[PDB]
């Protein structure tokens, strides 16, 4: 364990190896220290466990932050302009710095991480009965609370 310098922040055991590169990647590009890691290894689990939990979802092809495909459309330029190259839906690290660069986004505007959480989840607009784009219910507000609670547990220090 003992890590040079010593801020490294820990992968929670349960968050697979390879995401907690993706995540750590993205937090790098946001100046994190670490914290968004956690943050977002949170919602990864929620949004498809890690890649292990969507067989048989009709949005598995949404990959691993379920962004919906009009979601990613509307973000590409913002994405290269972030990254420095084209969004590529095939590479797992290109999905995560999507959903990062998003859910930074939401953070940022509504001012916190919950908040930043709920709109993530259910876009400017959710209310409670608001569908997605494959017709299911979007339950953003409990979204909010398991995914706030998860980063928390995973030893999330913020809530803006």
């Known amino acids: 364990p003992p890590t040079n310098p010593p801020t490294t922040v820990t992968k929670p055991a349960e968050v697979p190896s390879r995401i907690w590169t993706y995540v750590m990647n993205a937090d ?13 290894s949170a919602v990864i689990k929620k949004e498809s466990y890690f890649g292990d939990g969507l ?25 290269s302009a972030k990254y420095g190259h084209a969004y590529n839906h095939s590479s797992e690290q290109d999905q995560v ?26 876009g400017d607009y959710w209310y409670p009965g608001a569908t997605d784009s494959y017709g299911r219910p979007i339950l953003a507000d409990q979204y909010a609370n398991t995914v706030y609670a998860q980063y928390k547990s995973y030893g999330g220090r913020y809530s803006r």
């Open 97 to 122: 710095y999507m959903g990062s660069l998003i859910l930074n986004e939401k953070i940022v505007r509504f001012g916190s991480i919950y908040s930043g959480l709920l709109h993530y989840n259910g």
């Open 28 to 40: 790098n590009a946001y100046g994190k220290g670490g914290d968004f890691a956690l943050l977002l």
């Open 55 to 79: 067989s048989g979802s009709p949005s598995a092809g949404d990959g691993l932050m379920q962004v919906e495909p009009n979601t990613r459309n509307a973000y590409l330029s913002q994405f």
